[PDB]
Symmetry: T
Subunit: 161 residues, 12 copies
């Protein structure tokens, strides 16, 4: 006849503080990566300027989309993101991007390292995130895949022979 | 040459339990889509337009979801049943009420029914994943998208 | 201000209980049709699978747009639709769609019959709808036209000449 | 040449003065509605501003397309529209829209009333239009349907249940 | 199963021979119009060539969509269209389009007359069509409206005021 | 830290004169749009189609213009009045005539009324620019686009 | 300066034979388009939908083709005649039958009539090419596209 | 004949002070984008959806703006700094508060932060305009677009 | 403060065995694309058009898949080999037969070849998943998409 | 097995005479584009708008054409020269007159200049075709497209 | 009551000969830049060929759009542009582009200089244009901004460290 | 009266075995080029990586479209293509692409040579194809033109001064 549930209030999945903190770590590194990516995009000069200028904007697009995905995943699971500038600066694990113009070769090396750092944060929190919520780990997989692709597309400029 | 011979390589086939598990997800997705449209038409009051619009996006997602699940069943040699009698008789979702409903009531009602739908997917997840990880990925997309819908809808009623 | 009306409140056209009832009958058959169309879409097998699989989705798209149109027309005229599963199952005039895989030949005949039942419901209510509100009768004409087109496009598969 | 007519000049269907007059009445109320819709769009303030601001532009889009449709239908049938500011102001049946900023609650009620007055004009002329030219009555059905949809979408904001 | 019908076969609405005949008359005039429209499109020369050349293609697009609509409506209602060259030539009511290059002034008058003849055919069959099937009459309204718009857009070139 | 404190930083607000100046531009833009449609429907004769089409582009521009100006007013705490009575009572544009009008007449009539509209914007420009340069940029777009429309329309009647 | 003087450089003009040759291609293209629509509406039976859809693509191509040829005629100072009487009286295509026709019959009928149309283009090709190679390129596009249509349609009836 | 004979002609160079002025605009645009996203995620309550959506539109505009300014800097051989430390250390915007915030609070908070960003642009405007009018036009685009966002957002809390 | 201090931090490196596993997937995806095109061209008979079209959809998916796998290899510093000799020498797929083939035969042939490709992905899945879960998700996308293609194609020959 | 064993195989090389032939086409296409824009700006009178619009379509085609020719030159290692001095010094087109010109005059002027451009292509055609048939096909595209433009434009002045 | 003006003829803004001449100077340099940009686009060879090939086409697109904008602004203000090849060659201030293939490095330097020259013309005429017509100066600002952006995007290839 | 042909069966153009074999030669080289192009696309590293990565994908797109065009032309003319991997490997005339990563400079040289080889096959079979069927030769012209353009766009990277 009927399999319908009777509750007037069915709660959603609530993330633990640890899980919330793990997604927060991913978030600040994705935002920092986005900010560094734009810095590089503006300030790269030299041989093959245009390709890097353009590829960096694609990296920024992906990182911005990723940061929105992570922050909104946090919101869906009743966690509260902090993407404010002071928090990002105080808590990012990425080495700082240097000031002023940088050569194409240096930008390639610098950004590759910073992508590598961002991915490392995602890989570090992965198993804990997966254990609590496999659906969030899938979002992490997309970020890993997308960012490591960016790393290859950027770094290959400096790879010799 | 590493070429195989077999002129009849059969596809991966779902166990009856696996098919039954996807059938559970399917009816709740269809029921959610029907309830979402009902809410979409009959919601009234403060912030009507936002709710009206958001509910349709929920329905879009839930419909795409039901098709995905039903066709995954087909791919794995299982047979979906999305007929009205079956949905009404087997859905775990609390019945959505008839008639006009306030935006505040619709927010609470629909959030409960999304959560009910997610709960079904979360209930079958581990058994699905154990048999076929590729199908559990489809479940993850569903969980992610619906829990996003719950957040976007319920936030309307959130106080301070 | 010459021809301007001075009423503070000007009320809209309100559907009679008979009118509301008549559109409700159309609504449940459109929704039932959509549900059966998907069932057929998923479970059809055999000769010319792909064409039928594709046409059935087009039928479903039209029936879904149709049900939304009718339900929203009800709302516009201060009537209240009921498109819930229990109501559709309990009140649809469509012959039940069978379970399990069905041959393309079977599906063509089954769906043609169910489309025709849906159109019949619309044709049955048409004159009473038209008498109260010509504008709504026009929406019914769209449905009759579009559904009868679907019936021709599907049924022609089984036609032997 | 078997069934071919041999007339050098075959004249088109020409609207009667009554018909032309009736479409003119629809035209001025559609234009007045568009103008008031923009006024409301600009000057609405308060709770749920954005939704109302957006819906009012959709109303205006529909009313503008509607007025163009009516005026061009007049032209097609050898009638002459007058959509000039003085004429619209002097001959519209719509209650004047108030000046200054208006609350969202106020705007909902005000615009619902003005939409309803516009629809009333169309409903009043409908039968006389339909008697002379069924094809034009169909354009009126489109307007009635679309405007009553707009009224429902707007008015529902103020509905307390 | 409460309100569900139990008929194995539910047949669709079938057009009478009179109805089928009436739509066939519309069909041949729409196709003749399309053919003449292309002839005019290609062979028009003189003052305001480009505008006429372009408008004639829009007329042809509408007439082609119209003929497809009518023929498919026939099919939907178990009637059989005949749009073959011999049939169109033998049974069209349109005055023959002249051969060779034609001035823009000449083309405006010629095409206006042929559009009007096409609309006349639709207007002549309208009431008999509407009496049997209101849904098809609505398709006729679309054709009347669209073709009379075309006539206005074309004929206005030759209007001296 | 260079961070400011103030929890209530107010926006730039237009003087009454500034608001009045934008109101002047607004009514002429709306009136032009209404006259443009009137011409669009009622133009007849040689080169009807081009004029019919061009007039609609004029109307599109003038409507986008009126919205831009009215919303700029809103941004600066001014209140537009685009109602029919106000437009008829306060527009500086010579009245467009009723009834069918020849393409040659429509070209001359509409050119005059575009020029009237541009003249209003040119009349208020310096006072607008002195108070708010950002708003004068919107005026420049209007001047540029409308004077383009005048050229595209009037060239029809240009002899040799 | 390598600038020429001539204030009246005339265009390439087609001989009467060339115009007559393009006229031949034109009527067969128009007739094919009319027969294609007839088949599109009246085809019934096994695989109706594919045939119904493919026939419309044939018609699209044939219509674009007829316009291309007729306008090429215009470019070269020739005058097309695509009127119904002329098409019926001068087309080389076997008459398409009235009434409902099976998909199998429609495949055979339409293939024959496409081949008839291609044959016309192939018949006039060398004479067209000798006078104007640029026009023969248009003929090649027609041959290529129609022979593709023939393959896509006839393959339905191909046994083993 | 009128051709200049230098093998390399130099482009326009921004003074370092001009560069510093655009840098002030840049950091507040970036700060505003970051705060807008914070608000976009964390806003809850009555009319959540409209605010959530409008805040993304604000961020889109602010991100486009910061790109425009940074690339204008580069065109004139100034060197932007949009790094997190620099933005945090030098922005004039009041810090956005942590945690969930009501729609009413978000409206007032974001309006103030938009108004602060506009204030920076208005403050540097004249010094920028004096050196390079073309850059001032970009500033006008920002003032116009941001003040529009301020109106669109603050209107939610306006009581009349 | 929390910033890491290495000038160069290394990314994730795939073991050569992991690389070899993706290489197995790659060659079968490329082989499947090549066979799918062969079938697409050479299929004849009843329901030709649907098969012709569906086979192109399969090829689109397989080509996108092989690109995804090859680029995942590159991301992790493995080196793909999609050259014709390598594909022919190392594919596990049964060879596709030459010449025209009936729609019924093509359905059975292509279903088997899809099933072989899926089998390869399923065979390497666990070893891939153990080293890099993110790559396994790409494998799941392929399994899901290919098994869908298998169902869509094989359904033609299913008799119920 | 059938693989060629040269490490570098040379591509097809255009003779310098072939290069010079395409160069003749190039300068007249560029000249035509420049004159077409001149006419586009300066045309006045009866049916201004159609001419203004058609002239832009001509220019679009001529610009696409000149790019096609210049890039064909580069493909075959010829080196185009589209510089203003070279175009002015070597074009075969009669100079376009200065100042405003009536629509009737523009029609006749532009038709002649199109016809001159076509004449150049037709003049070099056979020498181009003899060396490289693939390039001649590009010439055919130009002849066809330009002769279409000639008909579309000149038809305005045709009296029948 | 009424604020309507009474003139049957209201003239538009007419540019002085000096203003007309100033826009003419901008026009010939924009056209020359477009022609040189295509020359460079075709004939650039060497390291980073593709990026420059592509960026040069974007420069050409902008310069062509700019030349149309300036010429049409002239037309709007009753001035008469001259974009003919002989005039452009005789009156452009740009140094001539050299013949034959050029290296990527040389093309970067050459084109940067020619953009710089084009912008200089716009900057030279600016204040005079602005004094007479501020709305035209705004168009000049767009050209300056757009072209200096192109200069940066092109020149950065050759900028070292 | 009537020019209609009387045959119930009109056959299409059938290609000779030689013609079929000539198109087969073009086909295997186009497929081989596509496979080598993707290999290069994945494995190119070094200075100007991105441009080559991207340009190679465009080459692949063109070659794949070309191979479909040739195979389908064969089908239209009753010939039977063989694009299977073993056939392509056994019968392609292209030198083999080397294994593993290759520098940008080496990839430019290698791919240019392989395009040159592919075009050479098309040029070798051209006159024979043209003699039998001029319409197919036109398709060959498009391939020659499109591929030689790719060759220029790729090779220009390595061309010095
Ligand atoms: Cl919204
Ligand atoms: Cl036009
Ligand atoms: Cl299909
Ligand atoms: Cl690029
Ligand atoms: Fe995933
Ligand atoms: Fe997983
Ligand atoms: Fe009716
Ligand atoms: Fe209708
Ligand atoms: Fe300014
Ligand atoms: Fe040829
Ligand atoms: Fe501007
Ligand atoms: Fe060609
Ligand atoms: Fe978001
Ligand atoms: Fe589906
Ligand atoms: Fe809806
Ligand atoms: Fe209109
Ligand atoms: Fe059709
Ligand atoms: Fe607006
Ligand atoms: Fe045409
Ligand atoms: Fe940028
Ligand atoms: Fe790729
Ligand atoms: Fe190019
Ligand atoms: Fe232009
Ligand atoms: Fe294909
Ligand atoms: Mg590059
Ligand atoms: Mg809202
Ligand atoms: Mg089929
Ligand atoms: Mg015209």
């Amino acid at each position: 006849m009927s399999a319908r549930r009777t509750e007037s209030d069915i709660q959603g999945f609530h993330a633990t503080p640890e899980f919330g903190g793990n997604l927060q770590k991913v978030l600040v590194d994705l935002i920092e990566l986005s900010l560094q990516g734009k810095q590089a995009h503006w300030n790269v000069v030299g041989s093959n300027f245009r390709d890097l200028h353009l590829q960096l904007d694609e990296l920024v697009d992906f990182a911005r989309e990723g940061s929105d995905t992570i922050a909104e995943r946090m919101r869906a699971l009743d966690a509260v993101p902090d993407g404010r500038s002071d928090t990002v600066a105080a808590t990012t694990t990425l080495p700082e991007f240097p000031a002023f113009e940088r050569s194409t070769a240096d930008v390639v090396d610098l950004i590759t390292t910073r992508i590598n750092a961002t991915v490392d944060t995602i890989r570090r929190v992965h198993d804990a995130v997966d254990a609590e919520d496999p659906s969030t780990a899938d979002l992490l997989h997309g970020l890993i895949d997308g960012l490591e692709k960016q790393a290859w597309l950027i770094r290959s400029e400096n790879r010799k022979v």
